[PDB]
Write a protein that binds this ligand. Structure first.
Ligand SMILES: CC(=O)N[C@@H]1[C@@H](O)[C@H](O[C@@H]2O[C@H](CO)[C@@H](O[C@@H]3O[C@H](CO)[C@@H](O)[C@H](O)[C@H]3NC(C)=O)[C@H](O)[C@H]2NC(C)=O)[C@@H](CO)O[C@H]1O
Ligand code: NA
Length: 129
């Protein structure tokens, strides 16, 4: 599923991401936009052999198990395929865990390089929230 911008904002808010750890909803919509282009099925191989999965490109080296990432931890205790569902609940639960692990949203490279310090409020403009 490729989410619309406001559709994803409403889902992220419903799953409790707005201001989770102080990150406004726009931060999460922006991060999902540049990580996956709002595509829940997005997957990307990393050079270290891990893979990034779903709307928030959660990495298999640390957060999920994909059975092909040597040295991986599975701190969200979930199959990486479960991060590709059209229902983003699992991605949100794992993102809540990730953003609380110490480096906040800097865990998302696209957020750090493209959203951090920007007018992230632009990402929720017009959404019924
Ligand atoms: C969205 C996503 O998957 N992003 C990936 C990043 O999570 C990942 O960076 C590494 O993340 C782990 C977990 O947050 C970092 O480990 C934590 O480090 C902090 C101190 O910095 C400490 O409080 C924690 O104990 C420790 N947690 C664990 C479980 O060990 C780790 O430092 C990050 N590594 C780097 C190089 O930034 C990167 C790299 O795998 O990939 C992103 O896609
Ligand atoms: Na794994």
């Amino acid at each position: 599923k490729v989410f619309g911008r406001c559709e994803l904002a409403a889902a992220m808010k419903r799953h409790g991401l707005d201001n989770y750890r102080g990150y406004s909803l726009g931060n999460w919509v922006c991060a999902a936009k540049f990580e996956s282009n709002f595509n829940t099925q997005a997957t990307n191989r990393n050079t270290d052999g891990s893979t990034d999965y779903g709307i928030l490109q959660i990495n298999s080296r640390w957060w999920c198990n994909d059975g092909r990432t040597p040295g991986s931890r599975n701190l969200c205790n979930i199959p990486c395929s479960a991060l590709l569902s059209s229902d983003i609940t699992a991605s949100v639960n794992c993102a809540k865990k990730i953003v609380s692990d110490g480096n906040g949203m800097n865990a998302w490279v696209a957020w750090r390089n493209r959203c951090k310090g920007t007018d992230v409020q632009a990402w929720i403009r017009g959404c019924r929230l």
